[PDB]
Each structure stands twice: as structure tokens, then as C-alpha cells.
Design an enzyme around this catalytic site. Structure first.
Site, PDB file in Angstrom:
ATOM      1  N   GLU A  35       0.811  -1.230   0.000  1.00 33.56           N
ATOM      2  CA  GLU A  35       0.000   0.000   0.000  1.00 33.56           C
ATOM      3  C   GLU A  35       0.837   1.271   0.000  1.00 33.56           C
ATOM      4  OE1 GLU A  35      -3.011   0.388  -0.599  1.00 33.56           O
ATOM      5  OE2 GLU A  35      -3.947  -1.559  -0.143  1.00 33.56           O
ATOM      6  N   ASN A  59      -9.001   5.229   2.753  1.00 33.52           N
ATOM      7  CA  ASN A  59      -9.695   6.044   1.758  1.00 33.52           C
ATOM      8  C   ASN A  59     -10.744   6.994   2.350  1.00 33.52           C
ATOM      9  OD1 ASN A  59     -12.080   6.535  -0.073  1.00 33.52           O
ATOM     10  ND2 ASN A  59     -10.729   5.652  -1.545  1.00 33.52           N
TER      11      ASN A  59
END
Ligand code: CL
Ligand code: CL
Ligand code: CL
Ligand code: NA
EC number: 3.2.1.17
Length: 129
Positions: A35, A59
């Protein structure tokens, strides 16, 4: 901050991610690796205008507030900027919420595509935890 592998594994363990929701520590470190490459200040803009923040690329569509994601929620009740701290508490705390959400770690598209079903335990190998 760019964490070391074993350094992050320790921090994650301390913050209670090891087997959190059935997910062994290796799963969390592998996810962070792909990530953010262990970098707490990682951001990545999505095609929909939402942005992913920090070590686990959380997010803004759902999970934090950045004030520039129209029609989004802040389910973790944090400014997204909290996800960029050298201190991973807010990241870990929000991730517990996300991995509890129903799809488990598949919420992290890179965990699904790059970590799921792999020897994830390799990521914690030879770490003093
Ligand atoms: Cl850095
Ligand atoms: Cl917003
Ligand atoms: Cl699960
Ligand atoms: Na949001």
C-alpha cells in the site's frame, strides 16, 4: 516516517493488529508494504476524487475527512491527515473498523491481489516482536 519491516511489525503488534479479526501480523505488514511501502506520509489520489492516506492507504470515500471528497463519509471520525502521523495509532484504529466491516482485509485491494493466499508469515520472519 518510513518504518522498517520488523519495526512496523512490532508497532502493529503493540497496537493490537496481530490476529485482529483472524488476520495474522504478516497480513498487515504485507498490506502496508504494498500500500505505502511502509511510509506513513503516502497519499494516492483515486480516479473518483477520493484520496488514500498513510501506511494502510485508508480512503476518504468512507473512512476519514479531508474536506474534498464530495458525498463521502468519515466513519473513523478523524481528519485524514491523522493517518499520516509517524504514530500509527489512528491508522491502526481506523483499520480495525475497516477490517471489521464485513469483507475483511479484501477492503485493501493490494492485500487481495498481492498478499492474500501467500506466505505472509515471511514478512514477520526474524523480527523481535
Ligand atoms: Cl521519510
Ligand atoms: Cl469531504
Ligand atoms: Cl475475514
Ligand atoms: Na470522507
Amino acid at each position: 516516517k518510513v518504518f522498517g519491516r520488523c519495526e512496523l511489525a512490532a508497532a502493529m503488534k503493540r497496537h493490537g493488529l496481530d490476529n485482529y479479526r483472524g488476520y495474522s501480523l504478516g497480513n498487515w505488514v504485507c498490506a502496508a508494504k504494498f500500500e505505502s511501502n511502509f511510509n506513513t506520509q503516502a497519499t494516492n489520489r483515486n480516479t473518483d476524487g477520493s484520496t488514500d492516506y498513510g501506511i494502510l492507504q485508508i480512503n476518504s470515500r468512507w473512512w476519514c475527512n479531508d474536506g474534498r471528497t464530495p458525498g463521502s463519509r468519515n466513519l473513523c471520525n478523524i481528519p485524514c491527515s491523522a493517518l499520516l502521523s509517524s504514530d500509527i495509532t489512528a491508522s491502526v484504529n481506523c483499520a480495525k473498523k475497516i477490517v471489521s466491516d464485513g469483507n475483511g482485509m479484501n477492503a485493501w485491494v493490494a492485500w487481495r491481489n498481492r498478499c492474500k493466499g501467500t506466505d505472509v508469515q515471511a514478512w514477520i520472519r526474524g523480527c523481535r516482536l
